[PDB]
Structure formats: C-alpha cells, structure tokens
Design a protein around this motif. Structure first.
Motif, short mmCIF file in Angstrom:
data_model
loop_
_atom_site.label_atom_id
_atom_site.label_comp_id
_atom_site.label_asym_id
_atom_site.label_seq_id
_atom_site.Cartn_x
_atom_site.Cartn_y
_atom_site.Cartn_z
N UNK E 89 0.81 -1.21 0.00
CA UNK E 89 0.00 0.00 0.00
C UNK E 89 0.85 1.27 0.00
N UNK E 90 2.13 1.16 -0.33
CA UNK E 90 3.01 2.29 -0.63
C UNK E 90 3.26 3.19 0.58
N UNK E 91 2.21 3.80 1.13
CA UNK E 91 2.39 4.77 2.20
C UNK E 91 1.10 4.90 2.99
N UNK E 92 1.19 5.61 4.12
CA UNK E 92 0.01 5.82 4.94
C UNK E 92 -1.03 6.70 4.27
N UNK E 93 -0.58 7.74 3.56
CA UNK E 93 -1.51 8.57 2.80
C UNK E 93 -2.19 7.78 1.70
N UNK E 94 -1.44 6.92 1.01
CA UNK E 94 -2.02 6.10 -0.04
C UNK E 94 -3.05 5.13 0.52
N UNK E 95 -2.75 4.52 1.67
CA UNK E 95 -3.72 3.62 2.30
C UNK E 95 -4.96 4.37 2.76
N UNK E 96 -4.78 5.60 3.26
CA UNK E 96 -5.93 6.41 3.65
C UNK E 96 -6.82 6.72 2.45
N UNK E 97 -6.21 7.08 1.32
CA UNK E 97 -6.99 7.36 0.12
C UNK E 97 -7.71 6.12 -0.39
N UNK E 98 -7.03 4.97 -0.35
CA UNK E 98 -7.67 3.71 -0.74
C UNK E 98 -8.86 3.40 0.17
N UNK E 99 -8.70 3.63 1.48
CA UNK E 99 -9.80 3.40 2.41
C UNK E 99 -10.97 4.34 2.13
N UNK E 100 -10.67 5.61 1.81
CA UNK E 100 -11.73 6.55 1.47
C UNK E 100 -12.50 6.09 0.24
N UNK E 101 -11.77 5.63 -0.79
CA UNK E 101 -12.41 5.11 -1.99
C UNK E 101 -13.29 3.90 -1.68
N UNK E 102 -12.76 2.98 -0.88
CA UNK E 102 -13.50 1.77 -0.52
C UNK E 102 -14.79 2.12 0.22
N UNK E 103 -14.71 3.04 1.18
CA UNK E 103 -15.90 3.42 1.93
C UNK E 103 -16.91 4.15 1.06
N UNK E 147 -8.29 12.81 7.59
CA UNK E 147 -6.96 12.22 7.68
C UNK E 147 -6.15 12.47 6.41
N UNK E 148 -6.79 12.31 5.25
CA UNK E 148 -6.10 12.54 3.98
C UNK E 148 -5.66 14.00 3.87
N UNK E 149 -6.54 14.93 4.24
CA UNK E 149 -6.19 16.35 4.20
C UNK E 149 -5.01 16.65 5.10
N UNK E 150 -5.05 16.15 6.34
CA UNK E 150 -3.96 16.41 7.28
C UNK E 150 -2.64 15.84 6.77
N UNK E 151 -2.66 14.60 6.28
CA UNK E 151 -1.44 14.00 5.76
C UNK E 151 -0.90 14.78 4.57
N UNK E 152 -1.80 15.30 3.71
CA UNK E 152 -1.35 16.08 2.56
C UNK E 152 -0.70 17.38 3.00
N UNK E 153 -1.35 18.12 3.90
CA UNK E 153 -0.81 19.41 4.33
C UNK E 153 0.50 19.28 5.10
N UNK E 154 0.88 18.08 5.52
CA UNK E 154 2.11 17.87 6.27
C UNK E 154 3.29 17.48 5.40
N UNK E 155 3.09 17.30 4.10
CA UNK E 155 4.15 16.91 3.20
C UNK E 155 4.23 15.44 2.87
N UNK E 156 3.22 14.66 3.23
CA UNK E 156 3.20 13.25 2.86
C UNK E 156 2.89 13.11 1.37
N UNK E 157 3.36 12.02 0.73
CA UNK E 157 4.17 10.94 1.32
C UNK E 157 5.68 11.15 1.22
N UNK E 158 6.11 12.30 0.69
CA UNK E 158 7.54 12.56 0.58
C UNK E 158 8.20 12.64 1.95
N UNK E 159 7.59 13.40 2.86
CA UNK E 159 8.12 13.56 4.21
C UNK E 159 7.69 12.37 5.06
N UNK E 160 8.63 11.46 5.35
CA UNK E 160 8.34 10.39 6.29
C UNK E 160 8.21 10.90 7.71
#
Ligand SMILES: O=C(NO)c1ccc(C(=O)NO)o1
Ligand SMILES: O=C(NO)c1ccc(C(=O)NO)o1
Ligand code: NA
Ligand code: NA
Ligand code: NI
Ligand code: NI
Ligand code: NI
Ligand code: NI
Ligand code: NI
Ligand code: NI
Ligand code: NI
Ligand code: NI
Ligand code: NI
Ligand code: NI
Lengths: 173, 173, 173, 173, 173, 173
Positions: E89-103, E147-160
């Motif tokens: 699932x690549x990263x936490x942001x990617x998994x969050x987006x996948x979960x959003x799509x699934x829901x 969660x996706x918004x917060x992860x995006x505004x923090x520099x994810x997924x580039x910033x670990x």
C-alpha cells in the motif's frame, strides 16, 4: 479406532501406558518414605511432609498422562503397581539418595519417550513432554542433589543432630 | 573539550575510568562466588543470595561512576573485564575472606583516588567519594570481617555443620 | 562427575559457557551505548534509558544460563569480557543498527546452540532455548528493525530534529 | 530482503501464507455454521453462539500467523477465501462432524508445517507451532469428538428433543 | 417459504447477500492494510491499530446483515471473498486514500440498497439501513477525508517525518 | 517392639496392613472408572468428576489407616496394588453397580476388622473404625444404591439420553 486419533502411533500409546504405571509406582515409593518418617522411632515430621507432597505430585504426573492418552485417541491400560524395594529406609540421607535415584530413572524413561516421540514425528507429544515433565524432573533432581549434599556435609547419617537440624531448618519451611 | 568541563583534571578522569573498571571487575568476582554456591556439591542458597546482591551493588557503583564522569565533562573509556582469579572458591569462609581482600583493595584504590582529588583541588569529586563510596566500603569491610570471625569461631571450614547453620541463621535473614 | 548430571554432553557444557560469555559481552556493549547517550554533547535521555534496560536484560540472560548450567550438572567457567568495538557510537540510528547487528549475532549463536542440543539428543536444553531465548531474540530483532526504519524515514542521522522527536515520541513511553 | 530476516526459509514463508489462508477459510466455515443455527427453522441459539466463538478463534489464529510472518521477515500474500462447501448443515450433529473434519484437516496442515520447520532447521518456528497451535488443535478435536459422541448417544439427528436438550445443557454453559 | 417472511421481496434478499459479501471484502482489505503497516520496513503501529479496528468494524457490519437476513425470513448465501487489489500500500496517505475510496463504494452500494428497499415498499429494511449503516458511512468518509487532508498538508508521502508525527499525534490517541 | 505399643495385638496389625492395601486398590479402581468416562467415545465429564473424587477419598482412607498404624506402634508393610478387574466399564449404570459392589466388599472387610478389634479387647481401634469408617461406608452404599435406582428407572443403559441427563442433573451439582 477412535474418531479423534491423528498422527498418534501405537508405540507412543504403549510408552504412555508404561509411563503412567511408572509415575504411579514413584508415587507409591514416596508414600512409603513419607510414612516411614512418621514412625515413632524415626520421627521426622518435615521429611514426612516433604515426601507426602512428592507422592501427590507424582500422582498428578500420572493423571496428567492419563488425560493426555484420552486426548490423543489412545486407550488407557492399567497394570499392577509394584511394591517399593524397601520398607525401612534407614535414614533421611538414605531416603534422599533413593529419591534421587528414582527421579533419575523416571527422567531417563521420559527422555527415551521423547526420543520415540520425535522419531514417530509426533511434535505434539514431543512438546507435551518438553513442557510438562522434562524441566520438572531437572528441578527435582537438582533439589534432591542439593539435599543430599547438605545432609552429607553435616555429618549424616552418623550425626542424628544433623538430620534433626536439617528437618527443622531446610524442610520445615 | 566539553562545554561543561570545569576544574576537572585529566588525571582525575583517568582515575575515574580505572575505578569504573575495578568496580565492574568486583561485580564479576561476586557473580562468580554467587553461582559457585549454587552448585549441587556446594549448595548454600543464602551465600549465593548474599554474593549476588553484592555483585549488583558493585554494578551500581560502576554506573554511578559513569554518570559522575559524564557529569563533570570527562569521557568514559571502557576496558576489558578480567576473569576472577578463581573458579572454585573452596568454602564459604574462603569466599568471605576473598571478598574481604577484594573490598580492601577497592577501598585502597578509592582512598588514593580521594588523595588525587584533594591534590588537584577538586572538592566536588572529593566530596563525591566521601559521600557515596568511602563509608559504604568501611561498612562492607566491617561486615565481611564479622562474617569471617563468626565462621571461624564455629569451626569452619572443617565443620560443614557450621557453614550450614551460618547460611541459615545469619545470611538467611 | 556431578551426581545430578544426566544426558548432559560436554560439548553442550562448553557451548553454555561460551553463550554465557556472549550474553555478558552484549550487556557490556549496551551499557556502553547507554552511557554514550548520557554525554552532554549527545544528550538523549530516552535512548540511554532504552539501552540501559537492554543491558540489564542481557545480564538476566547470562544469569539464567549460569543457573541452567548448575542445574544440569555442568560447571561454570568464566572468561574475560571483551571491550565493545567502539567508544563513540556517532548517532542514535548508528547505535540502533549496531544493536541490531549484535542481536543477530547472538541469535545465530543461540540457533547453533539449539542445533547442537538437538544433535546430542538433549530435549531439555533444546526446549530451554526454545522457550527462554529464541522468541525473545526474534522480538528484539523485529523491534530494532522497526526503530531503524523509523529513524531512517525521519531523516536521521542528518536531521538531529528527527532523533530528538524520536527520543521523545517513541522511546519516552 | 528484509533487514530482520534470519534463518527464515522461503518454503516456510509460503507455508505460513497458505496456513493463514486456511485459518481464514476455517473462520468463514464456522461463521456459516453459526448463522445456519440462527435461522427460524433451525433455531438453536447456543449452537450458533458456539460456532461464532469458534469463528472468532480461527480469525485469531490467522492474525497470529500474520504477525509471525511480519516478525521473521517474511511477506504476507493474501489469497481469496473460498466459500464453505455447504450452505445448509442439516443438523447440529452434522455440523459437529463437519467441524471435527475441518479441524482434523487444519491439524494435518499444521503438522506438515512443523515437519517442514524442523527440516529447514528453524527451531523458532517449530516451537511457535508447538506452543500456539498444536495443543489447541488437539483440545478442539477432543472436544468436537465428545460433542459428536454425546449427540449420537442421545438419538440425534432423528430426535430433535436430543438436539434441544444438548443445546440447553451442554452448549448453554 | 419461511414462516416469518412478510413483505420481504427476493430482490431485497439478493441485495442483502451481496452487501454481506461486500462488507466481508472490506474487512479483508482493512486487514491487509493493517498488517502492511506492521512490516519492519513500514513500521507504523498506530496506522496498523487503526486499520485493524476498522476491519473488525466491517466484520460487525457483515454479521449485523446476516442477523437481519435471518430475521426477515431470507436465507444467507455466502460467496468467495476476493483478494484485495494490492499487497503493498506504498504509504500511509495512499492507504488512507484507498480506504476513502472503498468506503465511498460501500456507501453507494448501501444507498442503492436503500433505494431498492423504498421501491419494494419495505419500510423496516429502509429504516434498518437508515439507522445502522448510513450515518456510520458518512462519519467514516468524513474522518478519512480529514486524515487525507492532514497527511497532505504535512508533506506526505515525501516527508516520512510527517507520517511518523501523524501516527503519533493523531492515530495514537 | 516399639516404645509406644500398648494393647495392640499383631493380628490387628496385619488386619490394618490388609485394609490399607484394600483402600489403595479401591482408589485404583475408582481412578480407572474416572478416566474411562473421560474417553471420547464415552464422554461423561461429571461421572468422571464423581469417580475421581471417590478415588481421592479412598486414598485418604488409606493414609488415615497408615497414620493409625504408626500411632499404635504397628509397622506398615505395603503390598502390590492389583489391577482393576476391568478396563472397559460398559456404561455409567454398570460402573455404578461395580462401585456399589466394591464398597460393599470394603464394608464387609471393615466389619470383620471391627469384630477382630472387639475380640482382642482393643476399644481404641474399635472406636476408630466406628468413627472414621463405618458410617462413611454406609453413606457411600446408600448413595450408590440411589444412583443405581435412578439410572435404572430412567431406561439405562439402553437409553443414552438417560445417562446424559443424569450426568447433567444429578452428578453435575
Ligand atoms: O533429527 C532428525 N529427525 O528429526 C534425524 C535423526 C537422524 C537423522 C538422519 O537420518 N540424518 O542423516 O535425522
Ligand atoms: O416517493 C415515491 N414513493 O414512495 C415515488 C417515486 C416515484 C413516484 C411517482 O411515481 N411520482 O409520480 O413516487
Ligand atoms: Na563532606
Ligand atoms: Na517446545
Ligand atoms: Ni514424575
Ligand atoms: Ni530431528
Ligand atoms: Ni536454629
Ligand atoms: Ni564497590
Ligand atoms: Ni541476550
Ligand atoms: Ni509532539
Ligand atoms: Ni485454527
Ligand atoms: Ni434439564
Ligand atoms: Ni461497512
Ligand atoms: Ni474406603
């Protein structure tokens, strides 16, 4: 054939029956020692307490093995319980040495049982012996050796003072 | 040079490293004695308890000195820990005498360290040794001397009865 | 020969002595790391806490093996404890990687010990290693790998901010 | 290759993935049985409770294996979960027999996994199977056999009175 | 026909079976994500906790629907559970987006189910969906978007660093 | 001759030894029955509980007699414990009838012992049997008769339903 039997070889079943009989015999021997120390001409109450507890522990071993037999699909076959080799155990040091010998014999029997279990590719029985019997036998042998060493360094069995003070300060606690 | 170093001479730093190594070595020796008394042919559980506690106390000494080194601006340099002089300590009285000798040696080392600290005009290190090490060594030496005297007056090491009763009535409390 | 020795091969005894020495050495290395992070120019108190706890755990490993040796009838032979390879561990990530390497080495030693135990048909020692050492090493290796991964993904060791925030949010809890 | 992988063979990794899938499938089957007994034309609430609990236990098995995989350095690969063989389980005795068969199959799979683990000289995985799976399967098989025997001796599945009284007096407690 | 069936159309029954399968599949996907974040090269324990809890919630959804089916007089028909689209699932942001799509997909399925229920004039099923599923999906979608918004505004997924601090300060509470 | 022996005839001593052996044998028989009902093809857990408790009670009888022997100045002489007459006890009703027969035999032995005690003018032993053994045997015989009657009136051993419901409603409390 029992509906629960799986990967349980009949050689293992016979070994389990023999080990049941052996644990029962060890319980009988410990009972004999316990009530030997209850006699008025011996009169060491803590030695008797110790060996009575050991007898009950060996009976627990036997019942554990019977439940294991019924669990794997084996069938319990009980044999006669032999009379202990002696009726007079001479002294506390002598009874301790006899107990050490008995536990070493039971330990060798359990080790050969574990070998037979690993040979017949029975990992459940192998780990059952590993977990519920082996380390307990190691601890019992080490403890009996400690007791024999202490009784020897105190002048037993010549010094009855030694056996009295040992009954008080080591087994009475 | 560390930003916190003040009035800390490098001779003091080397002495601190050497004393760290010495406390670690004393801990090793006490560990050796402790598990010597755990053997089935010795079998004195309270002697073993006593020497294990003493080993942990010496390790505490070592860690205290390491924290002191980092506090003053020194730099820790660890050395090998030498193997104890013996692997068989013969008897409880012999181990007590060896412990008394070891503590006297460590005490002389600490006293020369205090002399070096008062010479280099380092009152903080002088009072650190005064407060956290000197009186503890005095108490340990007095206690080991008491134990040696008691074991001697009881007939040790010839009388194993003496060592048993001492393990029970003095160290088992 | 000790009165309690049964099915205990001397190759196993030598392996037990070597593993005792190795666990002591690992404790020494963890102590070194712990007090490296206590220096004023490093100053990561939770890293130091972590490695001090790990040192105490390794000392527990060593004492467990000594008791096992005395239990089976073996005889403890202590060797020198070697000085750790380094005195300056550069960074928290570097110390984590060194710890991972050390635990992998100790794990391979324990695995070869288990192989030697199953070869000499010593199921008690085999299960002792199975039960008290193997899974603990697996958990330690997985945890050190997790820590190394997290420190890497945060920009360590270039970003000292990363090591500070890791000391606070992961090791300080 | 993962930084934590040590002595973990890839055949073991594939076996772990297959066993994960099998435990998930067993959970699915138990879920099917549980809600079969919730139908208005069956209506045995304690049978349903029993099989729902068993489904949750099998899911716990699966998650345990996934954590084990991540622990040793393996990599989880999930497959489809097959639909249970049946949608109508006829009776409580029939469902009990199906559960006994399923647990025997899972047990044989775990036994062959333990054989593969001892072959690849992986004592950690061998003891993991020994400790967390084998005896649990033995207990489950013995319990399902007890239930099948009791239901048979009561006149099931012809006597619905038998299944009602069994749901009340055995599973409702 | 079941004696309890009343106003329950068979199209509704088929839709209920399909929605059961979909909730089970969503549980499987969340399980996959959860144990993806448990790998040593990802190592985000709170992400894993979050997705494991979400998997258990989806399984609760499925069981609720099965009980509803048995309640109205329908008949459960289980299908295979498909493997998740990804294993990495690549990263936490990617998994969050996948979960959003699934829901969102599950939500559209539930909305069309509610439409079919209001069409077949089944107010009980309509209110069941209204009460036990719709608002829960709305809350889940809003939370995943946060969660996706917060992860995006923090520099994810580039910033670990961002994903680490998010795992600590948002999901670890 | 023991310093405590007074008014203790040697015929009484031999009778005490024989009764010790008989109580041990009864304990063995009850153990056999107990684990017969633990088999997967019998599977009556409360029958097994009942007979295990009875076995422990008989062992208590034996130990009581041994203490009595040591009390009066007699000397314990242990014999072999014979294997029970059967290994398969057919049914719960059959085991109950066998237990009733065994207790009647032990009761006749105790009654002849009391006769021998009143003949040798040993009121202490007479009252010991009166107080600690006779009424207990009467209660045991009455209880076993009650159980046999109830099992018979329920259709045992043909009706396995009867034995199941008896295991639940009478012995499971
Ligand atoms: O440990 C073994 N099985 O679990 C084992 C015993 C003997 C052999 C063999 O045949 N080596 O060549 O393997
Ligand atoms: O809401 C409605 N039923 O509950 C509904 C849907 C379509 C119509 C209609 O046919 N309007 O002309 O009514
Ligand atoms: Na001062
Ligand atoms: Na094991
Ligand atoms: Ni035993
Ligand atoms: Ni092998
Ligand atoms: Ni005293
Ligand atoms: Ni010191
Ligand atoms: Ni270690
Ligand atoms: Ni913060
Ligand atoms: Ni399972
Ligand atoms: Ni009833
Ligand atoms: Ni859902
Ligand atoms: Ni009796």
């Amino acid at each position: 054939t029992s509906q629960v039997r799986q990967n349980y070889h009949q050689d293992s079943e016979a070994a389990i029956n023999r080990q049941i009989n052996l644990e029962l015999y060890a319980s009988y021997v410990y009972l004999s020692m316990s009530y030997y120390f209850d006699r008025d001409d011996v009169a060491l109450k803590n030695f008797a307490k110790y060996f009575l507890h050991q007898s009950h522990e060996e009976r627990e071993h036997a019942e554990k093995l019977m439940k294991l037999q019924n669990q794997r699909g084996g069938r319990i076959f009980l044999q006669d319980i032999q009379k202990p080799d002696e009726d007079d155990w001479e002294s506390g040091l002598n009874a301790m040495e006899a107990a050490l010998h008995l536990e070493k014999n039971v330990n060798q029997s359990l080790l050969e049982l574990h070998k037979l279990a690993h040979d017949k590719n029975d990992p459940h029985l192998a780990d059952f012996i590993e977990t519920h019997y082996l380390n307990e036998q190691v601890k019992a042998i080490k403890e009996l050796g400690d007791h024999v060493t202490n009784l020897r360094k105190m002048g037993a069995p010549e010094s009855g003072l030694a056996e009295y003070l040992f009954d008080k300060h080591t087994l009475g606690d």
